[PDB]
Structures are given as structure tokens and as C-alpha cells.
Design an enzyme around this catalytic site. Structure first.
Site, PDB file in Angstrom:
ATOM      1  N   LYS A  86       0.838  -1.192   0.000  1.00  0.00           N
ATOM      2  CA  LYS A  86       0.000   0.000   0.000  1.00  0.00           C
ATOM      3  C   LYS A  86       0.877   1.248   0.000  1.00  0.00           C
ATOM      4  CE  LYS A  86      -0.131   0.067   5.013  1.00  0.00           C
ATOM      5  NZ  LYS A  86      -0.674  -0.647   6.194  1.00  0.00           N
TER       6      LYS A  86
ATOM      7  N   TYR B  74      13.089  32.194   6.482  1.00  0.00           N
ATOM      8  CA  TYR B  74      11.946  33.008   6.872  1.00  0.00           C
ATOM      9  C   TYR B  74      11.920  33.246   8.378  1.00  0.00           C
ATOM     10  CZ  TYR B  74       9.886  32.382   2.225  1.00  0.00           C
ATOM     11  OH  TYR B  74       9.646  32.397   0.872  1.00  0.00           O
TER      12      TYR B  74
HETATM   13  C1  LIG Z   1      -0.424  -1.941   6.379  1.00  0.00           C
HETATM   14  C2  LIG Z   1      -1.089  -3.107   7.044  1.00  0.00           C
HETATM   15  C3  LIG Z   1      -0.322  -4.234   7.339  1.00  0.00           C
HETATM   16  C4  LIG Z   1       1.189  -4.187   7.312  1.00  0.00           C
HETATM   17  O1  LIG Z   1       1.682  -3.518   8.451  1.00  0.00           O
HETATM   18  P1  LIG Z   1       3.262  -3.491   8.765  1.00  0.00           P
HETATM   19  O2  LIG Z   1       3.485  -2.964  10.161  1.00  0.00           O
HETATM   20  O3  LIG Z   1       3.923  -2.585   7.755  1.00  0.00           O
HETATM   21  O4  LIG Z   1       3.833  -4.885   8.657  1.00  0.00           O
HETATM   22  C5  LIG Z   1      -0.941  -5.430   7.670  1.00  0.00           C
HETATM   23  N1  LIG Z   1      -2.314  -5.503   7.706  1.00  0.00           N
HETATM   24  C6  LIG Z   1      -3.084  -4.398   7.415  1.00  0.00           C
HETATM   25  C7  LIG Z   1      -4.581  -4.506   7.460  1.00  0.00           C
HETATM   26  C8  LIG Z   1      -2.482  -3.192   7.081  1.00  0.00           C
HETATM   27  O5  LIG Z   1      -3.291  -2.119   6.802  1.00  0.00           O
HETATM   28  C1  LIG Z   2       7.802  31.138  -3.200  1.00  0.00           C
HETATM   29  C2  LIG Z   2       8.522  32.433  -3.421  1.00  0.00           C
HETATM   30  C3  LIG Z   2       7.774  33.553  -3.782  1.00  0.00           C
HETATM   31  C4  LIG Z   2       6.278  33.605  -3.556  1.00  0.00           C
HETATM   32  O1  LIG Z   2       5.998  33.748  -2.180  1.00  0.00           O
HETATM   33  P1  LIG Z   2       4.495  34.024  -1.667  1.00  0.00           P
HETATM   34  O2  LIG Z   2       4.518  34.416  -0.210  1.00  0.00           O
HETATM   35  O3  LIG Z   2       3.699  32.752  -1.838  1.00  0.00           O
HETATM   36  O4  LIG Z   2       3.869  35.133  -2.480  1.00  0.00           O
HETATM   37  C5  LIG Z   2       8.400  34.650  -4.354  1.00  0.00           C
HETATM   38  N1  LIG Z   2       9.760  34.632  -4.565  1.00  0.00           N
HETATM   39  C6  LIG Z   2      10.512  33.532  -4.218  1.00  0.00           C
HETATM   40  C7  LIG Z   2      11.994  33.542  -4.463  1.00  0.00           C
HETATM   41  C8  LIG Z   2       9.902  32.425  -3.643  1.00  0.00           C
HETATM   42  O5  LIG Z   2      10.684  31.350  -3.308  1.00  0.00           O
END
Ligand SMILES: *Cc1c(COP(=O)(O)O)cnc(C)c1O
Ligand SMILES: *Cc1c(COP(=O)(O)O)cnc(C)c1O
Ligand SMILES: [Cl-]
Ligand SMILES: [Cl-]
Ligand SMILES: [Cl-]
Ligand SMILES: [Cl-]
Ligand SMILES: [Cl-]
Ligand SMILES: [Cl-]
Ligand SMILES: [Cl-]
Ligand SMILES: [Cl-]
Ligand SMILES: [Cl-]
Ligand SMILES: [Cl-]
Ligand SMILES: [Cl-]
Ligand SMILES: [Cl-]
Ligand SMILES: [Cl-]
Ligand SMILES: [Cl-]
Ligand SMILES: [Cl-]
Ligand SMILES: [Cl-]
Ligand SMILES: [Cl-]
Ligand SMILES: [Cl-]
Ligand SMILES: [Cl-]
Ligand SMILES: [Cl-]
Ligand SMILES: [Cl-]
Ligand SMILES: [Cl-]
Ligand SMILES: [Cl-]
Ligand code: NI
Lengths: 396, 396
Positions: free
Chosen positions: B53, B279
Site C-alpha cells: 500500500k 523566513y
Molecule cells: C499496512 C497493514 C499491514 C502491514 O503492516 P506493517 O506494520 O507494515 O507490517 C498489515 N495488515 C493491514 C490490514 C495493514 O493495513
Molecule cells: C515562493 C517564493 C515567492 C512567492 O511567495 P508568496 O509568499 O507565496 O507570495 C516569491 N519569490 C521567491 C523567491 C519564492 O521562493
């Protein structure tokens, strides 16, 4: 950044396809936000560079670019090569620039997209120049200056050696300086104005000492916040991201939310009082309960903080998530509701009836920022165009 | 769960394609883990159902299924329709079952994949039966029992009404009960022993009250933990997941880590003491520093939560990550390293030289089990195949 769909793959956006959870993309809202910004800037205002990194902030660059093209937006800012590819494939023929530093491999393999790179160090610029020379072409570059103090992609002219490097970068064969930029680290007017003042000095020095002509150089510094609150940072071009998706300064309500997050009920299961729900038996039922099983979990980007207080909307009412988030499933208490059936629509983010899960609600949890959430939501779930589903439309 | 690559799309796994960050998937380790489990279970042991999954736990079901096929594993457990599609396309011809409740739309559109569904309520079973009847076909189903107390997908036989519903579910036209299962909510020996003891009672009651033929029913309950620590929970078939990927009980070193998380340096920038990084200026340089700019951020699945301990590996050395994580970029302090340059490989999770990014560390910094992170790593970054053959010799 993942592989994006090939040009011939038009699966994304389709509404009929089965999805365990999905993003409802409101193209109208996005198109409204673009026009709203235009009106604010005016016909003599700075050019707009729509920032669409991270697959258009999780909204899907493949789905939104056509709107940007229709609006005649001259510039688009992206991060990955795949984003550049899709932008071109969806009909964008304007300026395409990367808003982050890139690896040598990225720069070299992005040549087919006729995009422009961002440089903030001599060694990096030299590497990019070498690539351009080997491919017998030209790579336009924007010079990132650290005037505002982000200390990320920009070269810092407070260092003597950096000043020398900056001038050397401009003279490298293979690249052409076509812009000068900085970026504000703090969304506060006083801080932005400080960086703005310093950027004017830095950009002027680079132009003078580097003997660059202003008619060939695009100067740009403002993101969403600076664009809205500090118009003195307009310069030649602005770089709005958040506000285009309705995720900027909340009090500017004219910019509308573009995304909503939904799922469906898989099954409604009956459990007696005393039972516990989910891994580690962290939630105990105080009464005989009917829990709605929803087919999404933390692998689908939802409630990755496994034990955070959370609500979803069913029948236009807020119902609580119970038990730890599983990889692919979450449980919701619908004991108070009647007639809940498999297939019933559930809203994880957005409106349903008169109720709404708001960015204000989701960010109530410490450390939560919606921008992170929905980029991951977008990457891990299919997208569906809102207006395509018209079961409740009234046009005839 | 997103759309997965089409059958004709073979981009994923390719090593030479430019990637801002990527997961290194060791097929040799995966095949080793399968064989190692086989040897543990023995010749008269339970059958194995490889749980894949979430796109094979972020490893890429498209890349791993061929190994499962060659190993002759009889069963695969998936969650999404797309995962089922890819499993069949990559040559799997065994039992394909969903390990979670599904929506009516999912069930109906999954018919082409000839898979088996999971039911824990009469209403949900009736809906599936209706689908089968309409398509003039039959849908094999596994009856989920809440014997172990997960209270997620299973029907609880401690309720008189649920017992009656369970018997009614078995007789529904269009579906055929081919299995009985439960799932353990706690990774503790005693808790598992309590659950399996109750599961024996519940499964035997269903077989008797439902007058089911044992030869047509597969009984299964154990995940990785139960499989390794509680052989009493073997029953007919086990459902190991993490174990197969080397993400289970650390003491069992015989199971090797399949995936590593890597990136490259984009730029190395010089910043003076006093400068702040990222930031909101959350980190202040207390010395003249050279910071390595890495082209991935929280949109690529990297930690966004503040951390004064987080680190990565460069030149086989631990180096601290400084400043708040941006959407597409992070900064690393390489002031104590010599000759760091663009293109240099960085390990975000895994080993480099004598160094290593420990799983326990990342889980501490993020405040959640590693799967919460690496399923997102996988969805948001390309995969690159690694082969460690072996594992095996030939000497021809
Ligand atoms: C994902 C899941 C598993 C596997 O779990 P693991 O801890 O990764 O071994 C087994 N049974 C069900 C129903 C699951 O959803
Ligand atoms: C992502 C980013 C922006 C845009 O920022 P906003 O807050 O989403 O408007 C502008 N310039 C640079 C260099 C960025 O990495
Ligand atoms: Cl414009
Ligand atoms: Cl422009
Ligand atoms: Cl920057
Ligand atoms: Cl100088
Ligand atoms: Cl302010
Ligand atoms: Cl101003
Ligand atoms: Cl405000
Ligand atoms: Cl969330
Ligand atoms: Cl409603
Ligand atoms: Cl309509
Ligand atoms: Cl319609
Ligand atoms: Cl794809
Ligand atoms: Cl086997
Ligand atoms: Cl088959
Ligand atoms: Cl359907
Ligand atoms: Cl059958
Ligand atoms: Cl379960
Ligand atoms: Cl018995
Ligand atoms: Cl035992
Ligand atoms: Cl991480
Ligand atoms: Cl090394
Ligand atoms: Cl360190
Ligand atoms: Cl040196
Ligand atoms: Ni309509």
C-alpha cells in the site's frame, strides 16, 4: 519534486474517476485572483510573474497554466524541471524562470524549456556557464542578492570577496544577466522596508559597477506580502504566489480560496462502549458508537500529526476524528448523525452547507502551516476541476 | 493516493534523469528480505502476502512488484485502485486484495483488476454486492473481524446485531467470502496474544454459524511485529509490510534497509556573522559561514518543524541544517568542510562513509514514525534503482 504527467496524459482533473480523496480546484477563483491583482497594479504597474512552484502550490500547474496564458501573464516562476516542461506543454510562451538555486544536472537538462536560472555564487555561475558553452547556447540568469537577509539563494555584498565574485559572475561567457532580485524573509512592513532600502543600494551598485543597462535588466523583489503592503517594492516585476491561491494576508478578502479537500465514506461501523479506536488504543468510546471509515491517512497527506484534534464535515456538520491517523485510513464519529452511507461526501478542508473547515481552524495546532499541508495534499491525491461537477448548477 | 505511472511510462527508476531529491531503492535488499522471511517461516509455514500500500511504502510499487512476482509470492495487499492496476501490469497473477475499506466508486472501477475487497458492515457489503450484480460478475471478499480491537475496518461480534449482520453478509449474492481477518492495534506480545485468542473464537464462530467450507477461506491476522514476535498469529497467511522494506524491529538486522533519501548541493554561499537564515530569521549565524543550498523543501517531504539538532551527511560527515525549512529549499552549514561544491551528493536518510542519518533521530525531530515521512518522500520525489547483487554469486 516528482515526475509530472506526460503531455498525452490527461487523467488529472477528470471528475468521474474513482479517488480515495481529492482536491477540488476552483479555476474561477484563480482566474479572479489574477484579474484582481491586475486591477490593483494598474496598466502602468509592474509586470506579474505568477509563482507556480511545487506544482502550483498543490493546485496543479498542469491545470492552472492555461488560465495564466489566457490572462496574458508574461512571466511564470517555477522550481523543478518538470514544472517547466508542463508549463511549456500547456502553451506558456513567456518568461520562465526558476525561483531557487538548481543543481548542475537540473540546469543542463532544463535547456529544452528555454528557462532562466538563479545564481548567487561564482562557482555556481561558472558551472552554469560551462553547461551553456558545452551546449553552444545561452542561459539567461537572474542575480540573487542577499539585500533583505534571507541568506538562501542570494550573494551577500557585505563581504568584500562576494562583491568581486558578483562582478565576475556578470562577465562569464554562456550566461546573460537579465535580472536582479532579492527576497523578503519577514512579512512585516518595517522589516521589508529595511531590506528594500538595502536592495536599492545593492542593485544600483551592481548595475553601475557591472555596467549593465537597465533596459536589459528586470528588477524584482516583492512576494505576495510585499506586493500588497509595500508598493515601493514593485520595481519592474512582482512575484506573487500565495495571493493567487487565496493564501496570503487574510484581510484582503478579495483574493479567494482556490482549493478544497474532500473524501467519501467507505463504511459505517458499529462498536460498543469501552472499545478503543486505532493504533495504541488512544481513544476510548464512551458509548455505543457508529464510526465512519474514511479511505485516507497520513500517506495521503492528511493529519500527519497522528493525534491532532481534527474535524471533518458530513451532512454540513462538524464531526470529530477519533483515534490515531493510520497510513491509509481515519475514523470519524458519526453517532449523532443519521443516514450516513458509503459514498457520502466528506469535506476535510472547505465548505459544506453552512459549515466550513478554515485555514484558521487547521492552523490552530502549533506548528501547522496550510502551505505545507496542501502542497502535500496535492502531490498525494488526484485533482478535480470544480466547475466540471454541475449537479447543483442552475444554468439551462 | 495519486495517479501512478502508465504502463508505457518508464521514467521512474532511471538514474541519469535530473532530480532535486530522490529515493534510492535497493532491489537487492528487497529480494533479500523476502527470502529471509521465507526461511524464517519454513516450508510448512504460512503463506506471505506482501503489503505494498502507499505505492509500496514509498518505494514504488511499479519498481518492486517484478521482484515479488519472481519470488512467487502468492498474495499482494494494496490500498488504491492505481496500486492494483500497476501490480497487474507488472506481471502479478496472484491474489490481489485491498487491506482497507473502499468507496463504492473504488470497488466498481477496480473490477478490471480482478482483486478482492474488505468488508466490515452489512450496508457496505450490500453496496459491493449490488455492484457485482450489476456487472454480472463476482467480487471475492475478506470478512474483517474486530477481534483484536482496532475498531477500524472490522465488524464487532460482541454486538448481537453485528453477529446477525455478519451472517447476512456471507449470503449476499454477487460476493464470495474467501477470507477472514483481523488486525493488531498494539505492537506488544501480550496484546497480540489476547487478540489472536479472541480471533480464534470469532473466526471459528463465523465458519460454523455461516457454514463455510474451510478450504475456500484464508485466515490471516499478523503484521510485521506479530509475524516476527508471535508465531501463534501465523494462521494461514501473514501480512508483512515494513519487514520487507527493512523498517521493522531494529534488532532483526537480517532485514536490510531498502530505501535511502538523497539530494545534491545546488550552491555554496558565503554569509557573514550576524546574518539570519530563512523566513522569520529563526537562526542567527554566530560566525562567518559557508552554507550549502539544497534544492528541496517541505513540499518535497522534508521536515518543516523547527529543529536545533537536524542534520544531513556531506563528505561522510554530519552537518547541521540551519534556518526554517522553505517550500523548495533548505540550508546546511558546511563551514567546517573543505571543497564542497555544486553536485556533491547529500544523504538525507541512510549512510555515507562512516556516518549515518538514524531513523530514531528523524522520528524525534518530526515527532512521528518514519513511515509518516518516507511515504511522502516517495510521493514527492523520483525513485532511482539500486542493485546490490548480492546477495548472490554466479562464477560462470
Ligand atoms: C499496512 C497493514 C499491514 C502491514 O503492516 P506493517 O506494520 O507494515 O507490517 C498489515 N495488515 C493491514 C490490514 C495493514 O493495513
Ligand atoms: C515562493 C517564493 C515567492 C512567492 O511567495 P508568496 O509568499 O507565496 O507570495 C516569491 N519569490 C521567491 C523567491 C519564492 O521562493
Ligand atoms: Cl501583467
Ligand atoms: Cl517579464
Ligand atoms: Cl532568496
Ligand atoms: Cl569589487
Ligand atoms: Cl505588518
Ligand atoms: Cl510603501
Ligand atoms: Cl490584516
Ligand atoms: Cl491536515
Ligand atoms: Cl449539506
Ligand atoms: Cl450543468
Ligand atoms: Cl454534470
Ligand atoms: Cl505520472
Ligand atoms: Cl510464500
Ligand atoms: Cl491475473
Ligand atoms: Cl463508478
Ligand atoms: Cl471466489
Ligand atoms: Cl482493521
Ligand atoms: Cl479450533
Ligand atoms: Cl507465541
Ligand atoms: Cl526529514
Ligand atoms: Cl564519504
Ligand atoms: Cl551536526
Ligand atoms: Cl580552505
Ligand atoms: Ni453546469
Amino acid at each position: 519534486a516528482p515526475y509530472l504527467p506526460l503531455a498525452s496524459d490527461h487523467r488529472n482533473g477528470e471528475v468521474q474517476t474513482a479517488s480515495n480523496a481529492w482536491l477540488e480546484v476552483d479555476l474561477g477563483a484563480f482566474e479572479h485572483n489574477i484579474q484582481t491583482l491586475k486591477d490593483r497594479l494598474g496598466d502602468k504597474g509592474p509586470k506579474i510573474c505568477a509563482i507556480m512552484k511545487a506544482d502550483a502550490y498543490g493546485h496543479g500547474i498542469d491545470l492552472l497554466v492555461p488560465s495564466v496564458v489566457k490572462a496574458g501573464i508574461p512571466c511564470i516562476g517555477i522550481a523543478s524541471n518538470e514544472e517547466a516542461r508542463v508549463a511549456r506543454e500547456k502553451g506558456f510562451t513567456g518568461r520562465l524562470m526558476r525561483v531557487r538555486a538548481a543543481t548542475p544536472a537540473e540546469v543542463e537538462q532544463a535547456l529544452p524549456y528555454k528557462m532562466e536560472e538563479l545564481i548567487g555564487s561564482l562557482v555556481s555561475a561558472q558551472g552554469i556557464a560551462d553547461i551553456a558553452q558545452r551546449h553552444h547556447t545561452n542561459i539567461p540568469v537572474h542575480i540573487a542578492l542577499n539585500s533583505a537577509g534571507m541568506s538562501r539563494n542570494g550573494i551577500d555584498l557585505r563581504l568584500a570577496d562576494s562583491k568581486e565574485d558578483a562582478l565576475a559572475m556578470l562577465k562569464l561567457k554562456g550566461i546573460t544577466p537579465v535580472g536582479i532580485m532579492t527576497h523578503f524573509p519577514v512579512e512585516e512592513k518595517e522589516d521589508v522596508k529595511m531590506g528594500l532600502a538595502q536592495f536599492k543600494l545593492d542593485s544600483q551598485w551592481l548595475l553601475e559597477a557591472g555596467k549593465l543597462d537597465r533596459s536589459k535588466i528586470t528588477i524584482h523583489a516583492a512576494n505576495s506580502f510585499a506586493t500588497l503592503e509595500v508598493p515601493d517594492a514593485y520595481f519592474d516585476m512582482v512575484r506573487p504566489g500565495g495571493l493567487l491561491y487565496g493564501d496570503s494576508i487574510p484581510s484582503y478578502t478579495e483574493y479567494k480560496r482556490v482549493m478544497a479537500f474532500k473524501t467519501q465514506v467507505a463504511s459505517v461501523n458499529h462498536y460498543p462502549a469501552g472499545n478503543t479506536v486505532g493504533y495504541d488504543r488512544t481513544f476510548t468510546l464512551k458509548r455505543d458508537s457508529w464510526l465512519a471509515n474514511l479511505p485516507l491517512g497520513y500517506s495521503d497527506g492528511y493529519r500527519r500529526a497522528l493525534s491532532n484534534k481534527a474535524y471533518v464535515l458530513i451532512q454540513g456538520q462538524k464531526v470529530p476524528v477519533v483515534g490515531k491517523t493510520s497510513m491509509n485510513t481515519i475514523m470519524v464519529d458519526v453517532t449523532d448523525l443519521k443516514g450516513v452511507k458509503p459514498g457520502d461526501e466528506v469535506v476535510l478542508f472547505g465548505r459544506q452547507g453552512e459549515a466550513e473547515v478554515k485555514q484558521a481552524d487547521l492552523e490552530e495546532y502549533n506548528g501547522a502551516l496550510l502551505a505545507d499541508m496542501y502542497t502535500i495534499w496535492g502531490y498525494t491525491n488526484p485533482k478535480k476541476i470544480k466547475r466540471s461537477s454541475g449537479h447543483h448548477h442552475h444554468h439551462h
